[PDB]
Design a protein around this motif. Structure first.
Motif, short mmCIF file in Angstrom:
data_model
loop_
_atom_site.label_atom_id
_atom_site.label_comp_id
_atom_site.label_asym_id
_atom_site.label_seq_id
_atom_site.Cartn_x
_atom_site.Cartn_y
_atom_site.Cartn_z
N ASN A 1 -6.70 -9.67 -1.57
CA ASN A 1 -7.21 -9.96 -2.62
C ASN A 1 -6.94 -8.94 -3.68
N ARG A 2 -7.16 -8.91 -4.83
CA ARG A 2 -8.05 -7.37 -5.74
C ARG A 2 -7.79 -6.21 -5.05
N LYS A 3 -8.74 -5.79 -4.39
CA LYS A 3 -9.62 -4.41 -3.71
C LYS A 3 -8.13 -4.85 -2.80
N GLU A 4 -8.37 -5.22 -1.74
CA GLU A 4 -7.74 -5.12 -0.13
C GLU A 4 -5.98 -4.32 -0.69
N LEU A 5 -6.03 -5.23 -1.86
CA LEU A 5 -4.37 -5.15 -2.10
C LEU A 5 -3.87 -3.14 -3.02
N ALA A 6 -5.16 -2.82 -3.25
CA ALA A 6 -4.87 -1.75 -3.32
C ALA A 6 -4.91 -1.00 -2.52
N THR A 7 -4.77 -1.19 -1.41
CA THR A 7 -4.59 -0.43 -0.40
C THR A 7 -3.48 -0.12 0.24
N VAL A 8 -2.51 -0.72 -0.64
CA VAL A 8 -0.99 -0.71 0.10
C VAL A 8 -0.28 0.68 -0.34
N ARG A 9 -1.02 1.26 -1.68
CA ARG A 9 0.56 2.04 -2.20
C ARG A 9 -0.84 3.65 -1.41
N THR A 10 -2.25 3.39 -1.71
CA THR A 10 -2.95 4.41 -0.98
C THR A 10 -2.44 5.31 0.52
N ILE A 11 -1.12 4.31 1.10
CA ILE A 11 -0.74 4.44 2.22
C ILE A 11 0.27 5.06 1.90
N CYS A 12 1.30 4.28 0.94
CA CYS A 12 2.76 4.93 0.75
C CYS A 12 1.91 6.69 -0.33
N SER A 13 1.17 6.24 -0.75
CA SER A 13 0.80 7.66 -0.86
C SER A 13 0.37 9.09 -0.60
N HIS A 14 -0.09 8.57 0.78
CA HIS A 14 -0.90 9.13 1.71
C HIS A 14 0.50 9.61 2.67
N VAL A 15 1.61 8.47 3.21
CA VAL A 15 2.00 9.06 3.44
C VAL A 15 3.46 10.14 3.48
N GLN A 16 3.79 9.92 1.96
CA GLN A 16 4.17 11.14 0.90
C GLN A 16 3.57 12.54 1.20
N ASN A 17 2.37 12.30 0.61
CA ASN A 17 1.67 13.76 0.61
C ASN A 17 1.77 14.13 2.92
N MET A 18 2.04 13.29 3.57
CA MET A 18 2.17 14.60 4.45
C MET A 18 3.74 14.38 4.66
N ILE A 19 4.55 13.74 4.15
CA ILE A 19 5.99 14.34 4.38
C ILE A 19 6.16 15.86 3.04
N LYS A 20 5.36 15.74 1.88
CA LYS A 20 5.35 16.92 1.94
C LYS A 20 4.81 18.11 2.74
N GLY A 21 4.10 18.24 2.92
CA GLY A 21 3.52 18.71 3.91
C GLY A 21 4.22 19.28 4.54
N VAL A 22 5.22 19.06 5.87
CA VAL A 22 5.27 18.80 6.63
C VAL A 22 7.38 19.68 6.59
N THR A 23 7.29 19.05 5.33
CA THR A 23 9.02 19.74 4.50
C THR A 23 8.24 20.85 3.81
#
Lengths: 199, 190, 109, 176, 138, 247
Positions: free
Chosen positions: B63-85
């Motif tokens: 639904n609308r709320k739990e669809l909002a969490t699909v991008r936060t993970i992509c945002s979080h993992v990208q920040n985990m990539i920048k931190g290691v690179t």
RNA sequence: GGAGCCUCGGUUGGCCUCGGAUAGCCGGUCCCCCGGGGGUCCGGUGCGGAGAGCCCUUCGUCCCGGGAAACGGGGCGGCCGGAAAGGGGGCCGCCCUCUCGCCCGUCACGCACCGCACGUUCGUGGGGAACCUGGCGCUAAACCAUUCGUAGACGACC
């Protein structure tokens, strides 16, 4: 003849209802690991729901008033107490068949605990709802023995891992036995496959 | 309604070598390794493609709320990539009107002592987060650089010292004092 | 050389909520938990065996202390395996939650 | 009219009784969605009394037949035009559903109108049921099933029969 | 990660309902929680069936998303699902379950005598394996 | 209707069951929490209130009006003859609290301590610990004692010692000593236990427990005053003189 | 460490244990890396190394044969492991005991009580008196009275 239930992952009221009915049928029940019980709704909500229980005491004399027990086992025990006719003889005779514990005491640490899937959080709650561990909730409302029962429960966890690792290798020899004995029990397995016991 | 499927792939560069244990993701590479858990988010994380060049997130019947969490993970993992690179570099400025805010650092860049703030006799002691290294910059007077690979620990430890220097019961429009975050970048660039 | 009766629990009397009809008992036979599998037990003879202080005569035996109250499973009750039973004497209330035997011999197989 | 059980579509045609003034009145046909044909005839007179100056006492039902689905094995997209009543004022709506039978789509609407707007069946006047082509649908919750290669799992399989082994040993598995 | 996907042509096995214990092929998806399903060679008339009373298996057979029963029947016999299903370890423990249910009392006795002797030859074997591990240890 | 003028209540309810203490000797409700960093040491002692007197000293608190001046201060003398350890006791840590695990007494207990185990020393035959004393001259007994100490090395968490005063040295009338459990705060239980094992039947002067210029807590029973009215027990107002049923 | 009498009752084969996950698990091989873990690979997963389960199963006895056992079945001493509310659990030798024990078959018998109910156990059960017989042991304290006054209306308390 004694039902030993594990409390880890069960919803408080859902488990208390099934325990209360069994106990009224002359069944001796033992609920173990009462600190593992979960309550539905976020933690802060459940804490306020309990702090409002602490504020209810007989004004003129609190020593007579409601006895707010802080142990998780006694919190669960009181929940079942509300689902029984405890003011009667058959209600009090019932409560004596119930025996709750925090952690797993010695008489039951070496017994296979049952589980009630009809009262299990993984079944009765949507995965997006929040819940509260009875252990943490009890600790933040007065229970003093969370730290110790965590260490004692940690002891028996590796004391059981020893037994389990001993049990796999024990029956790993069993599975190795048939493929050494397959030629002299063949006339007995086909009888167990004919009636569907080994297939 | 319930959307049947919503997804988002995340391209990962070659120097970083990601791997996931169920719903937890560990991100290894040049500047170190990062590990974040997602067991509260309830999605499918599949790392597809030999060479392992990209990571997708899946959410079936959301639904609308739990669809909002699909991008936060992509945002979080990208920040985990920048931190290691490239790591994370937070520069903070010490703005003061009359009382110079002298700052000294103890335990090899993990504790900040803030003295003379507003001419107060009370020394302000702030403990950095594990994995974050604080430093005063050179060739510049009042800057307080913050390095680290986890954006959460860096940015939170920056808000620690940013809230540890606040003006009580005064007109904050007149007393524009304190250490504020100025620039948010990376320790190295390409 | 073994047990030849089914295990059942005297759950309670047939009641409403503020009236109980003690002439009919509600049983909970172990194993059966739905109506569609109670029809095997309909008509079967059930007994409440208990022991008292004074010795009583025993059919085919010398006087022991055990007595019985004979009954029979009349009809299914509820929707989840419970069953009604009528005894030659209304069961005593001290039997609520105790074992009563459900024999097999009025059998229909 | 209580939307009890699954509704059925009836074809009810009726007319005024013949008077010496007008020997043969014209016939009037309706599509009524009702539990049984008895409430269909009453619900027929409800609408006729609104559009015409006719009542059950001055009219008669010349044919009360049930109309069956011409394709109960084809998934179809249904458009429904309603006239429900809220606690404050009335509204016209256009709702879409996706079923096998028109009667099944209409009952799918009464339950949905009862769930979304707490509208009870006696306040709804379904006025037109048109089975529309997939390209002409509007609501997205229906449009997402128009896929030649639709494919999805059943992620969190809620345990049913959770009372057969009421006291089991193993924890249940919710992944298949 | 998932392996079984509800898609057009996936063979499913019905758990409950009047058809409990039959294979069936998903030909279309009506809405989120109900599919149009059909098992032609398994005595299941094409109908609408909710996703509860089905356990989707590991068999996918291809055909257009609305093809009439005739083409479903050919694709079902092309893949030969009926024989391939009977060879899975899933079906084999299904049919081995009612074999234990249709067990006559005499057959229940013959098992008791076969189980008794079989477990004896097992337990004394592992007994000879433990004493074979203790002189192995020293 | 509310009270016209506010006033704080009389007396604290934190001391509420104002009843005769069930104990005559002060009980340590809580011992200081220990840490294996420090050396082993006792945590309490047991003395007798002798009296009070003055003192003169030069205060050395800077910035005060009395800095580098002499003051007169009321002090209390507590006669503390050395105590003697007559046994140790272990406590396992349970989820129900602290359960006493095992008690081991010394071989030879003084008669003044044996007085404590009797209500009538004159009528008794003084047989206490007489058959317990026989467990130190036979190997079978001593081979059980170390199995009790080794067991407390494994399962006991907090270890206390049973010490008692020496009534003989006091000018008091009574001769029945006062037993007490003194928790041993210190290193690990192993070194905590063997320290007490060798201190057994030995003197412990107060200079071992406390040092000078140290803050301590005093636990005892208040001086009793019998049945008292509300004016003396809670310090309420005396009603005016005109009151009829008493003021 | 033996037989009987009262009395209170309920019961009518056992499960001796991983931890936990649930948008994931379980078991193996370890070719791999460090002091048990990690990684890998291979198997399962509408859990079959399944509680929809497992174990044990008893009509008895007498002969003889076959299969299975020989390391087995049954007995007195030490040995340790066990503490959250701790077992008659396992290990050594012991003199004696059997190829008897289980599975197929032979032979013979065991009130076949004449159609019928509380049968079949846990049961050397709990509690209580009175006898059995030996061996091993054990020889106290509380309260009153008196005294004290750190206490006190009286009891209590020191």
């Amino acid at each position: 003849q004694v039902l030993v239930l594990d409390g880890r992952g069960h919803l408080l009221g859902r488990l208390a209802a099934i325990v209360a009915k069994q106990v009224l049928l002359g069944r001796k029940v033992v609920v173990v690991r009462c600190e593992g019980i979960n309550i539905s709704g976020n933690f802060y909500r459940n804490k306020l729901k309990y702090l409002a229980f602490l504020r209810k005491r007989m004004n003129t004399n609190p020593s007579r008033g409601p006895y707010h027990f802080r142990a998780p086992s006694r919190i669960f025990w009181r929940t079942v107490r509300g689902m029984l006719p405890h003011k009667t003889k058959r209600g009090q005779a019932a409560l004596d068949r119930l025996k709750v514990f925090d952690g797993i005491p010695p008489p039951y640490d070496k017994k296979k605990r049952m589980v009630v899937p009809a009262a299990l959080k993984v079944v009765r709650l949507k995965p997006t709802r929040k819940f509260a561990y009875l252990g943490r909730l009890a600790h933040e409302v007065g229970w003093k023995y969370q730290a110790v029962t965590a260490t004692l429960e940690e002891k028996r966890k590796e004391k059981a891992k020893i037994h389990y690792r001993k049990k796999k290798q024990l029956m790993r020899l069993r599975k190795q036995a048939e493929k050494n004995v397959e030629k002299k029990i063949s006339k007995f397995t086909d009888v167990l496959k004919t009636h569907g016991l080994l297939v | 309604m319930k959307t049947i499927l919503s997804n988002q792939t995340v391209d990962i560069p070659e120097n970083v070598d990601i791997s996931l244990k169920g719903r937890t993701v560990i991100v290894k590479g040049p500047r170190g390794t990062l590990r974040r858990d997602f067991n509260h988010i309830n999605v499918e994380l599949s790392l597809l493609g030999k060479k392992k060049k990209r990571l997708r997130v899946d959410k079936w019947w959301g639904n609308r709320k739990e669809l909002a969490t699909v991008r936060t993970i992509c945002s979080h993992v990208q920040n985990m990539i920048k931190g290691v690179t490239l790591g994370f570099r937070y520069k903070m400025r010490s703005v003061y009107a009359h009382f110079p805010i002298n700052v000294v650092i103890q335990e090899n860049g993990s504790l900040v002592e803030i003295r003379n703030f507003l001419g107060e006799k009370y020394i302000r002691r702030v403990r950095m987060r594990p994995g974050v290294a604080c430093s005063v910059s050179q060739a510049q007077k009042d800057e307080l650089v913050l390095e680290g690979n986890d954006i959460e620990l860096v940015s939170n430890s920056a808000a620690l010292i940013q809230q540890a220097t606040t003006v009580k019961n005064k007109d904050i429009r007149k007393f524009l004092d304190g250490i504020y975050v100025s620039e948010k970048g990376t320790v190295q660039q390409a | 050389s073994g047990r030849l009766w089914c295990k059942a629990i005297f759950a309670g009397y047939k009641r409403g909520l503020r009236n109980q009809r003690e002439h009919t008992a509600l049983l909970k036979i172990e194993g059966v938990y739905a109506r569609d599998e109670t029809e095997f037990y309909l008509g079967k003879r059930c007994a409440y065996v208990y022991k008292a202080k004074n010795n009583t005569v025993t059919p085919g035996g010398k006087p022991n202390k055990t007595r019985v109250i004979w009954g029979k499973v009349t009809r299914a009750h509820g929707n989840s395996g419970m069953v009604r039973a009528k005894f030659r004497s209304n069961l005593p209330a001290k039997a609520i939650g105790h074992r009563i035997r459900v024999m097999l011999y009025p059998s229909r197989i | 009219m209580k939307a009890s059980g699954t509704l059925r579509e009836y074809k009810v045609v009726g007319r005024c009784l013949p008077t010496p003034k007008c020997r043969t009145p014209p016939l009037y046909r309706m599509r009524i969605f009702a539990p049984n044909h008895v409430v269909a005839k009453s619900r027929f007179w409800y609408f006729v009394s609104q559009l015409k100056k006719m009542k059950k006492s001055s009219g008669e039902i010349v044919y009360c037949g049930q109309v069956f689905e011409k394709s109960p094995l084809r998934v179809k997209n249904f458009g429904i035009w309603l006239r429900y009543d809220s606690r404050s004022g009335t509204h016209n709506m256009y709702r879409e559903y996706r079923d096998l039978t028109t009667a099944g789509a209409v009952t799918q609407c009464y339950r949905d109108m009862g769930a979304r707007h707490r509208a009870r069946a006696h306040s709804i006047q379904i006025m037109k049921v048109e089975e529309i082509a997939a390209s002409k649908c509007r609501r997205p919750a229906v449009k997402q099933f128009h896929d030649s290669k639709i494919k999805f799992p059943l992620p969190h399989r809620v345990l049913r029969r959770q009372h057969k082994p009421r006291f089991t040993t193993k924890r249940p598995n919710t992944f298949f | 990660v998932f392996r079984r996907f509800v898609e057009v042509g996936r063979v499913a096995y019905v758990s409950f309902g009047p058809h409990a214990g039959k294979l069936v092929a998903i030909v279309d998806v009506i809405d989120q929680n109900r599919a149009l399903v059909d098992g032609p060679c398994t005595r299941v008339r094409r109908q609408a069936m909710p996703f509860k009373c089905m356990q989707l298996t590991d068999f996918i057979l291809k055909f257009p998303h609305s093809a009439r029963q005739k083409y479903v029947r050919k694709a079902w016999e092309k893949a030969d699902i009926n024989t391939k299903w009977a060879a899975t370890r899933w079906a084999k423990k299904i049919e081995a379950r009612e074999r234990k249910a249709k067990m006559t009392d005499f057959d229940r006795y013959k098992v008791m005598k076969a189980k008794k002797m079989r477990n004896r030859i097992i337990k004394n074997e592992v007994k000879k394996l433990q004493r074979a591990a203790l002189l192995k240890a020293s | 209707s509310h009270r016209k003028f506010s006033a704080p209540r009389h007396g604290s309810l934190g001391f509420l069951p104002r009843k005769r203490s069930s104990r005559h000797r002060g009980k340590v409700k809580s011992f200081p929490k220990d840490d294996p960093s420090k050396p082993v040491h006792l945590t309490a002692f047991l003395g007798y209130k002798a009296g009070m007197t003055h003192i003169v000293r030069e205060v050395d608190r800077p910035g005060s009006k009395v800095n580098k001046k002499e003051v007169v201060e009321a002090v209390t003398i507590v006669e503390t003859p050395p105590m003697v350890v007559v046994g140790i006791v272990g406590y396992v840590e349970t989820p129900r609290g602290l359960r006493t695990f095992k008690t081991v007494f010394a071989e030879h207990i003084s008669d003044e301590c044996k007085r404590r185990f009797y209500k009538n020393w004159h009528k008794s035959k003084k047989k206490a610990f007489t058959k317990y004393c026989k467990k130190w001259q036979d190997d079978a007994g001593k081979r059980q004692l170390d199995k009790d100490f080794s067991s407390m090395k494994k399962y006991c968490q907090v270890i206390r010692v049973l010490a008692h005063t020496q009534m003989r040295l006091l000018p008091l009338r009574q001769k029945k000593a006062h037993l007490m459990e003194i928790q041993v705060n210190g290193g690990t239980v192993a070194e905590k236990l063997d320290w007490a094992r060798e201190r057994l039947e030995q003197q412990v002067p107060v200079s071992q427990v406390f040092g000078q210029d140290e803050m301590i807590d005093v636990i005892g029973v208040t001086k009793g005053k019998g049945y008292k009215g509300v004016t003396s027990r809670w310090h309420t107002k005396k009603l005016p003189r005109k009151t009829h049923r008493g003021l």
